[PDB]
Design a protein around this nucleic acid. Structure first.
Ligand SMILES: [Zn+2]
Ligand SMILES: [Zn+2]
Ligand SMILES: [Zn+2]
Length: 148
RNA sequence: GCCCUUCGGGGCAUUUGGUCAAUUUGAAACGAUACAGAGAAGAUUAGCAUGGCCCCUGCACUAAGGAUGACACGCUACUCAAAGAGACGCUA
């Protein structure tokens, strides 16, 4: 349960959690630090970029600990996905052909753009200009096409 | 990056965003202060309307209030002459 239980109604995590617990608290403390990052010098939409970046990083850590290295059990993986330690839909896109490096879900929400497009960061870099350092207004992505 | 392959080649994925963060120079509103002081032909006053490039409060743009909310109190030649005498004089 994502809802907090006091101490005596908490159930223990599945086995193998204590091996990755330090990195999980590293990601949690990184996100808590991302909460307190000055917005005085950057545009408003740039204030929310590190949260999407850290969510991507933590989901990628869980995803490649289970699918590439296979160093965690399936029960532990489903418990991590169910208790908010990884974004299950972003992982689900990562297992698809062409979305393996997708930055975030909001960058493929085609129903919510002006002309029903994806984000410009979904575009392969070869079809973009040189000296064009694009930086996604949704998350700060600099290009998340699979060929990149 | 991955997948398919008759290793010739092919496939999956496809253009975000009305926002400079940056307050003197792209537009807030008063109050205090000074000043003036609430309509109906003596004095004192309850009101209800009327007209709209005057509004305020209100959910009320089918209430009720805001001094009867305020405002009105001004300014004023022009559809415009005819007579029958007399007369400085005109004139037949
Ligand atoms: Zn994104
Ligand atoms: Zn994007
Ligand atoms: Zn992206």
């Amino acid at each position: 349960m994502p809802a907090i239980r006091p101490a005596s109604k908490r159930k223990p995590p599945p086995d193998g959690f204590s091996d990755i617990e330090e990195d999980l608290l590293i990601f949690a403390n990184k996100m808590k630090d991302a909460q307190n990052t000055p917005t005085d010098n950057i545009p408003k939409h740039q204030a929310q970029w590190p949260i999407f970046q850290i969510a991507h990083q933590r989901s990628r850590y869980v995803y490649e600990l289970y699918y590439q290295k296979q160093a965690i059990s399936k029960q532990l993986y489903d418990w991590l996905l169910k208790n908010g330690y990884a974004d299950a839909m972003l992982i689900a896109k990562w297992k698809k052909q062409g979305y393996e490096k997708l930055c975030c879900l909001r960058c493929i929400q085609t129903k919510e753009t002006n002309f029903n497009s994806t984000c410009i960061c979904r575009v392969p870099r070869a079809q973009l200009k040189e000296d064009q350092d694009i930086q996604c207004v949704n998350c700060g992505c600099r290009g998340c096409a699979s060929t990149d």
